[PDB]
Design a protein around this ligand. Sequence first.
Ligand SMILES: *[B]([O])([O])[C]([C][C]([C])[C])[N]C(=O)[C]([C]C1=[C][C]=[C][C]=[C]1)[N]C(=O)C1=[C]N=[C][C]=N1
Ligand SMILES: *[B]([O])([O])[C]([C][C]([C])[C])[N]C(=O)[C]([C]C1=[C][C]=[C][C]=[C]1)[N]C(=O)C1=[C]N=[C][C]=N1
Ligand SMILES: *[B]([O])([O])[C]([C][C]([C])[C])[N]C(=O)[C]([C]C1=[C][C]=[C][C]=[C]1)[N]C(=O)C1=[C]N=[C][C]=N1
Ligand SMILES: *[B]([O])([O])[C]([C][C]([C])[C])[N]C(=O)[C]([C]C1=[C][C]=[C][C]=[C]1)[N]C(=O)C1=[C]N=[C][C]=N1
Lengths: 209, 227, 220, 220, 218, 215, 195, 195, 213
Amino acid sequence: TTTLAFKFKDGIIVAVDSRASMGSFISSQNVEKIIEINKNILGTMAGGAADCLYWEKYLGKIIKIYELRNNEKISVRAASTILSNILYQYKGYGLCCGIILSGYDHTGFNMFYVDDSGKKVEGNLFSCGSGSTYAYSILDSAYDYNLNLDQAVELARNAIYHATFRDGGSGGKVRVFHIHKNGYDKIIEGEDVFDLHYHYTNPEQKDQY
Amino acid sequence: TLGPVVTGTSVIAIKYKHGIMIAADRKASYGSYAKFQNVERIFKINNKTVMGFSGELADAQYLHELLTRKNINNLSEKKRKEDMYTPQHYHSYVSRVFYVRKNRIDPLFNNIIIAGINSQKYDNNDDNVLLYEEYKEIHKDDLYIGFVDMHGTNFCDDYITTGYARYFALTLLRDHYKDNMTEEEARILINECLRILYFRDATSSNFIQIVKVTSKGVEYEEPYILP
Amino acid sequence: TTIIGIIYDNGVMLACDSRTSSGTFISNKCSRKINRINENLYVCRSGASAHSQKIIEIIKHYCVSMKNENRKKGRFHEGETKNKYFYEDKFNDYNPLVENVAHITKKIIYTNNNFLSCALIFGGYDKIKKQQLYAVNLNGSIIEKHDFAVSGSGSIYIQSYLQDKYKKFMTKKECFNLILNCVKYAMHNDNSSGGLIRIVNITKSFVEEFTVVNTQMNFQ
Amino acid sequence: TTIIGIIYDNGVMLACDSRTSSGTFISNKCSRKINRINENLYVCRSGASAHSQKIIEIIKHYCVSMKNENRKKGRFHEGETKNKYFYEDKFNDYNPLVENVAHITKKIIYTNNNFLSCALIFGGYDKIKKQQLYAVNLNGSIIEKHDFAVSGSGSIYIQSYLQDKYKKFMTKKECFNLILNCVKYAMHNDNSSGGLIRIVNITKSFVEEFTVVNTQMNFQ
Amino acid sequence: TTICGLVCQNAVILGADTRATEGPIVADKNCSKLHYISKNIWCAGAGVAGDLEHTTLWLQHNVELHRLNTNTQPRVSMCVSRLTQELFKYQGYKVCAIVLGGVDVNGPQLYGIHPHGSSCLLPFTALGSGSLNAMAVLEAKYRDNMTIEEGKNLVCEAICAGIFNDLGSGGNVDICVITKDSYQHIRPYKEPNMRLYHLPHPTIYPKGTTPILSEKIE
Amino acid sequence: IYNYNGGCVLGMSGSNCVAIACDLRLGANTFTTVSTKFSKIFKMNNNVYVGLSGLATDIQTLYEILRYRVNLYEVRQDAEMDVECFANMLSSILYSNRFSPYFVNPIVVGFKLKHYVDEEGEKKVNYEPYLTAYDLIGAKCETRDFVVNGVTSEQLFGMCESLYVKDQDENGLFETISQCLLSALDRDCISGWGAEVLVLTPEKIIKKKLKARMD
Amino acid sequence: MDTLIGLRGNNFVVLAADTYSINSIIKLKNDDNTKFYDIHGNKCLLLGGSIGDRLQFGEFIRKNVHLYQYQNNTDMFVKSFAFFTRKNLAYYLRRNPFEVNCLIAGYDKKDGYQLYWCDYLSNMDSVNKGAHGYGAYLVSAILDKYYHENLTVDEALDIFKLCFEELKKRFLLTQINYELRIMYDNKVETQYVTV
Amino acid sequence: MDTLIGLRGNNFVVLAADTYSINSIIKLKNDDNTKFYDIHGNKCLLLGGSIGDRLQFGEFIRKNVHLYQYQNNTDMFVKSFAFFTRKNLAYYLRRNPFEVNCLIAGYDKKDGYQLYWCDYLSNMDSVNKGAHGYGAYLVSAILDKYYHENLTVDEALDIFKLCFEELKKRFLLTQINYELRIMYDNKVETQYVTV
Amino acid sequence: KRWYPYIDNGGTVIGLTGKDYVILAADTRLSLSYSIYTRFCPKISKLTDKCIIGSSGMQSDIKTLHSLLQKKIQLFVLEHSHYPDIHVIARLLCVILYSRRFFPYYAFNILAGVDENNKGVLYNYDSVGSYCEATHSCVGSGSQLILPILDNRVEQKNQLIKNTNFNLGDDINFVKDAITSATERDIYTGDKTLIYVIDKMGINVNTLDLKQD
Ligand SMILES: *[B]([O])([O])[C]([C][C]([C])[C])[N]C(=O)[C]([C]C1=[C][C]=[C][C]=[C]1)[N]C(=O)C1=[C]N=[C][C]=N1
Ligand SMILES: *[B]([O])([O])[C]([C][C]([C])[C])[N]C(=O)[C]([C]C1=[C][C]=[C][C]=[C]1)[N]C(=O)C1=[C]N=[C][C]=N1
Ligand SMILES: *[B]([O])([O])[C]([C][C]([C])[C])[N]C(=O)[C]([C]C1=[C][C]=[C][C]=[C]1)[N]C(=O)C1=[C]N=[C][C]=N1
Ligand SMILES: *[B]([O])([O])[C]([C][C]([C])[C])[N]C(=O)[C]([C]C1=[C][C]=[C][C]=[C]1)[N]C(=O)C1=[C]N=[C][C]=N1
């Protein structure tokens, strides 16, 4: 389980893997972590399976009603705050979820990490999940905010690879989305046998390390 | 309901051609002490059903009251003989009782068996519950032998033995039971099961009660096994 | 706490000892165990004393709340062992008012189907079934004993002695001696040995409450 | 595991049942309990079967290691109940070789003053004290019973029945019936009821090992 | 794991299933639970396999060593005494519910042993998980002083109960008749087997991908 | 056997060639990889290959004690050491530590070298597979065909149970062990950062490192 | 708790560590510790964990190695040293745990620059890019991306500078001071890097 | 875990905090957090502990205070605010712990510059030099020595600069970035100090 | 002593799909820890004319989740007069399971059916409202043995992609292979199996007999 975000020069690159494991066994490997909340705000599953799939669907219900009654598109900051509050009500009940409610509203490109304990926080370069430590590693040394869409998704895909390659609980197809001034387009609904692309380009050994 | 102290033991309920033949010993043991040796563990909850019992005794007499008063609730709103509660109904109702309690953590430790004739092809449209010829063949598909574990696990077979016979008399039944047995064939088969239990099962004894649910009613008798 | 019930030919006896052990220290000798619910049916309580206290309080409340309730309106039935402290009292007979024992016993299961460890024994006279003698258990498992019933810590030391000496239809005299010797033995070799023992004789028309003060000596 | 020892006028009986319950499941009916240490003294073991196995193995090792040791050199004493399976054998009398029971019992305390929960009973004939009958306990607390001794799970249901029916000086016939009825009762109302019961009669000059196969029926 | 044995008119018949389970799955479906000890006594253990297998191997040789020092056929009353003494030192750790039998100067003797060390003498017994099932059918039809071809049939019928009515027991039943002079290990004895084989399912030669292939001829 | 230091080992038999295969991940923590070169199969003898799996601390410690014992025994015999006796060594070394056990689950594969019986000739040796398995206690179970042991045991029993077929040549046995291994290491997250298949024949040893999934 | 980073090319071995001494409740006791244990035989050794175990496992190994190189006029090879250090650490894993994390290093006349890797449980194996402590979750990925094969020694420092700013910017307890060892051309030199 | 320092003279109140967001396993999630909660009524509030409790105790107080200042055209005094914040925190101490550490501050027309101090257990009391978190073990003593009475606001910053270099040099997890609030002359201004 | 209220009755539910059909195969053994309650307890229930659900948890929860689910579907039929699509039943089960999140049903489910012309779709859950549409899946005691097999005969990570074509006639033989391979190697996998095939015209309940050991 991994995730990214950038708020780079002209949008946001949310990127995740697609693995879902139960201890050691791999329950499934074609799971869609990215969740479309609004036409602009799009969440990200992580941590527990249901305890994050359900709420971002539940948060989907809350925004549809509000965005309908007031007929103004909700903002990320408002969307994040609603999520963290209902997530707070279940402190001791064992909910486990880390959600990066990236999106776009009238006030520019926002971004908000949310955790199961109402850990709402504004930022630029969040990443949650078991491999997030490696994901921060690659980004911080490469992230520039003046990247263009071409090499930004290359950087996002690059990080998700290095996380999945090094981490055990992360792997499988990598997704890399992007957020315009409106909407979002799935730039990569991709593959993951590409270690033999980045490093160890020519298959002749095992790439010992 | 915190722990079993006065516990019954195994019952066996097979079906032969004239109806069910459910048998049970008549001992309730207060732990490792045969405190009661004339307790009855097979109650009549309808003119066509019985209700087996294993585990702690405090809860049969509970679950007996629940059914025995549901039965009269039926017996009051009955216009035709087809309005009676089939043994399937109870076993699907008892299953609910055990399951709804498993939602809480009070299971009422038991292994209730619901057995009876699941049909109305034989006229008994005058219920003398308070105070009470030849057998009829029964299609072996109109007889329902339920079972409910204290976790809600329920199913029906041709023969259901619960409690501790599930390791002793089940092996005999699984390889010597044939459909459409006869009166004396079932009794000797059961007597070859309980005699196995009485020898190897510490919490069981002689003095069997055998109940048969035939096309005419529910009949009782009290053998005493000969080793 | 030893505790007994025997059914002789025309009435039921209900003995007990009198001791409330609380961790090897006798809180009090000479404590009531054979309570009085109604004129004809007596409760022999055991187990934890605190729990058995409330139950008898509740039952005395119920057995009065329906003793008067099942009264018919008009006039009815106008057609007609040293140092043994003894006294008897009579009923208000024909038993239309006094309710059956079977209710009181079965009323217990509903009442004490809880986490309330008491092990009562009920003995009384009745109109329909003459002399019945029930045995509630820890979790409320009443079984109508027809011959005798024991309970409490010290009963199990006389289980066999009772089943051997108990005849079928006994007279009041020889039922008294058997129930006297039973409690004494359950006292001689048990550390819940009461002091005086309180034999009670519920019968058709009266209830006499003996008390006996004695010990055992053996020639062996 | 019920287990008995009675001392009649001129010899000691040692009954037992035959059942090895392991959690409500009879591991085996017809198991030995009245062991044979030497010709005259028999052990009635109880408690955990594994622990009682080693102890009897050790004792059989000791009782032989000194049976021969206390032999004098030269020639000495040149001056002179259905289906009951019975057989008797004789001693090698004058008892100079066969060592006293009191050692074997007291040898146990030293041996099983450990974390080894076994509750034996020893019965034998001897030269000096005629027929003794000890009762080792869980922690090795031997007390020489002079009248009778019981142990195991099912004994306490016949404690009173034994103390009542036990006379002082009994004959072999009426001691047999009492020890037969005792084990049967401890079996009728206990969930460690053996199958056949193995009455053993150690006496002055022989040892006869009965086995009885019977149940109880009561008129009540 | 179900193991049952019984005696006959002059011989003792052992018997066992064949499988070892990690607990949610099986490890193999052919694991001889009978175990040779000497020419005239065999043992058929249960419980954990590591403690089981080495206990017999240690005993299988410690009898031969004793048979060589003396010149008498080993006595079944001996091997039981060495088992219990070793087992009890490990009161609940060398867990192995061994049943063994054989012939000696006395008749055919069958001892049932338990992990703590309690050893009994029985005319028939069954151990392991299926012992409950095996003992039932074993006890109902057992009759004192039968003959081999119905003794073998019964013990095969006995384990066949523990094969079906139990989850921890399955595979091919087998038997070891231990008559006074010889033994008759009949390692396969019945056929509870598979149902469907659609095709061999072979793969074409170029599969995998093998970034490296270092081949060495010795 | 731990999720700490995940790993798996498999071995199957053919006509007269056997193949042993194992992953190459040394998992420092359960969900972390720190090496993709930790081969878990060792040449205990020129035709006795052992495949260890489990706690990587006790893989090497047990490997060294085996190499210490085997080299000792080979020298004192002037001759090579066959599997059948070696397999019973490993069932005693493990069992000697029954109370403080090495957390390894070894697999022993390699040719049995049946009799030097020499019918109608001076040399007649027919090699036989002789696979086997073990457990941390040391209980073995000889098996004429596949043996699997490791954390992925329950993901590989199923794969072996179907795809395995009785007798095959090396060019096909390698395919049905490589495809039988690769597709079970794609379903266990604590093992499978590179596989290695080593099929051996009475004449040559063929060692391959497959193109596994680095996930 | 303490970050150890080890890199190795084909003609150099570079080790790195943080020079803090966390080793008290919260007080950063010493801002320039000693974790490395330079052996004469052109090897090195780098430890982690509680200093009570570093000081007596590091010093114990320096002796038995130095004793070996003196009892036998030779100098121990890295591989023998790497599998000897592990063996002792595995020796005590069931008597006295010695909760330490190693990164053996060194040069050989035969096998060249070998790096190794031992966890607190003895899990020795050669690698090309090690890491230890809670900081290993953040420098490992950096090491993969920028470690192209056949590096020059000056590049590896630029990778290390890239790893150090990573821990400062994102690690929990922001290490600022680090100490390296640069093993190449048979010249074991040292340098300290801040930030 | 997070350091809060509060100082107060007779004509100023200065609060300080570290701007880290430890708030994940080990990853320094955000290097510039928001712990302060500026109230309009010329007060302030500074919290610590898990951000899940800061964000909903800080925001809950801002409302009930702002609601009060709007429902009643007045503006709440510091003392009422200080003993109201404590009361709610004590209200939930036996229902929902709200593990937070406060440093109430503010200005009054009557009582002047008041600083306060509440622990995770509600232990309110006025002080002149507060501190919280594991860093309070190191800045408290610094505050005593250099806090002479009737300070000028510029001196207090020099004390704070003296406190910040102390945490960097000797604290466990070396905080480098800090954010202050300088309340004086009815001018609540803010500034960020690095190192 | 504390009365742990969860048991695993075993059984497995193999699922497999294609452009025209979905294949759902479940055993019928219902076993307690080591003894066996019955040789035939159907773990597969049908909800609509073209949607079946298979579960492999504890039999009390299996039944009370299927009975409850049908109650909410026949309710849907009455109010809306048209049977719910599988997608509707998919989310409806997600909520029901998650509605009891903090005391979850011990019931792993696989939901199978057809929505478009065929477009054979198959969801699987884990006892708490988390469903991912998949090509092939199984849940139960034998789950860890079958998912490896199906991943090598549905998704081809082989060098040359053979068997890229799958026909209903042959896929049944794959499933019968999987359900039988697990039967030997797994303890709880049953003795009689029921294979349900949902094609464009209806459901077929053809049966197969497995090992009884
Ligand atoms: B990911 O690996 O964390 C993944 C997230 C995906 C479901 C959106 N979740 C899990 O792996 C969790 C356990 C876990 C492992 C490592 C870190 C955090 C959590 N398990 C599940 O999500 C799951 C999936 N299917 C069934 C059961 N559980
Ligand atoms: B009898 O011994 O059980 C006696 C009968 C009671 C009705 C007066 N009661 C008690 O002994 C109990 C102790 C006990 C014995 C056996 C099981 C459980 C409890 N007496 C008390 O508990 C007690 C009474 N007063 C003060 C303190 N404790
Ligand atoms: B008797 O019931 O105590 C009996 C006498 C023994 C000498 C054969 N033994 C046992 O019952 C014991 C159980 C036990 C009862 C009471 C206290 C302690 C233990 N039998 C066993 O322990 C046993 C024997 N074989 C196998 C398994 N368990
Ligand atoms: B049988 O199931 O008991 C079997 C008999 C064994 C001697 C071949 N053993 C086991 O199943 C044990 C677990 C066990 C079950 C029942 C009682 C005690 C122990 N497991 C193993 O024997 C084993 C064998 N190889 C590898 C792993 N485990």
